[PDB]
Amino acid sequence: PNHPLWYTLCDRYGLYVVDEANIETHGMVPMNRLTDDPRWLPAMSERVTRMVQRDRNHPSVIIWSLGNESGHGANHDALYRWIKSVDPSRPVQYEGGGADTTATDIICPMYARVDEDQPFPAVPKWSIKKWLSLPGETRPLILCEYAHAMGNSLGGFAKYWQAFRQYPRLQGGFVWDWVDQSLIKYDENGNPWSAYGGDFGDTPNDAQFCM
Amino acid sequence: PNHPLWYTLCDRYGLYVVDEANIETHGMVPMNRLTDDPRWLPAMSERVTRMVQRDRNHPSVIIWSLGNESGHGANHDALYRWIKSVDPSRPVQYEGGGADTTATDIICPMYARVDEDQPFPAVPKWSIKKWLSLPGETRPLILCEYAHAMGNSLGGFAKYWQAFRQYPRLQGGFVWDWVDQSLIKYDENGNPWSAYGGDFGDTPNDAQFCM
Ligand SMILES: CC(C)S[C@@H]1O[C@H](CO)[C@H](O)[C@H](O)[C@H]1O
Ligand SMILES: CC(C)S[C@@H]1O[C@H](CO)[C@H](O)[C@H](O)[C@H]1O
Ligand code: NA
Ligand code: NA
Ligand code: NA
Ligand code: NA
User: Fold this and answer.
1) Domains of chain B (ranges, CATH numbers)
2) Interface of A with B in 133-192 (CB under 8 A)
């Protein structure tokens, strides 16, 4: 959840918002080790329930998200249903565990390509055009993350938009991401420079991936 | 419906057969002027019902077709249901009126392209990949006619098969078509040669489109 003023501005300037719970357990092995553990349901529930209690009156928020990269656990299904029950005015989405689980109203993959499939075991990233028509699938598809803008990037961006415009159910996505997470440091001449992972003695680190 | 021996051979050699009623009113304006006319329901019913009564015991026949290029009329819906009722063991298909009407269990367009949409009024031919995922659509797609092999042709044939293999619901199609409808004529020297439309004084005619 963001600083409270953010929603006020989106309400007034006009931007659709996906409000997301502060829940990410990416480094766990497997990714859903905590989210499928009932012992952690309480902690997770508050991160979801208290967000809804705080932001449910903001018109800018149109979709609720159960968090990010935490695999797919039984706790997600429980909280998915809690939200659907308490606030039926907004769809609920969550990408963990394959982007099309029982815990999401929207197929919301991250970095699924336009025409090329990436058949990873258990959690494949199908071509988005293909994903829509898989047997029995009927939901809209909006990428929660796509077009990783790291450095000299965004090659192939037009291919996504051509598909978005051609396929009714391909309803867009959220580019990753808005601003480089570089930090200011100062050299001997007191000149400020942009720093990334590892520049503060932090280790281990993932260097420029924060930009 | 074909010569009776054809079904015998298909049963024994092994070929899936689409048995089609002898009904085509392509030349009408609009194309469904007769098929939507109840006065013509009797004549049409016999062409469908008598076909089913004759070939319903052939295992090679796996799909029934209500005919060809006769637009979409109420008579089609009536006969679609008649077949569904008397023989639930075989899906019923029909391309007329848009290839995805209420008279077909299979999206069976003719010459719909792989990636390119052909937004014709009332009866558009959508890209086959796009067709499968249109809002609310769930049926399989098998082209009743594609890759018009007229003369030096079949360019782009590989594009269809790549799509067929990638998309579960794109289950193939029927190339148009098997053999040139050329007829033999003889010159002054008694030497035989292949003739087409117009070579018999027949006029008006459509020349080489029979091949
Ligand atoms: C396979 C790893 C790179 S995971 C990858 O790292 C990215 C770095 O910007 C983002 O955080 C993505 O959301 C994450 O899935
Ligand atoms: C005249 C075309 C626009 S209609 C086209 O003609 C073809 C000729 O081989 C086939 O008969 C197709 O089935 C028919 O739709
Ligand atoms: Na779209
Ligand atoms: Na990053
Ligand atoms: Na297929
Ligand atoms: Na022809």
Assistant:
1) 1-211 (3.20.20.80)
2) 133-136, 138, 166-169
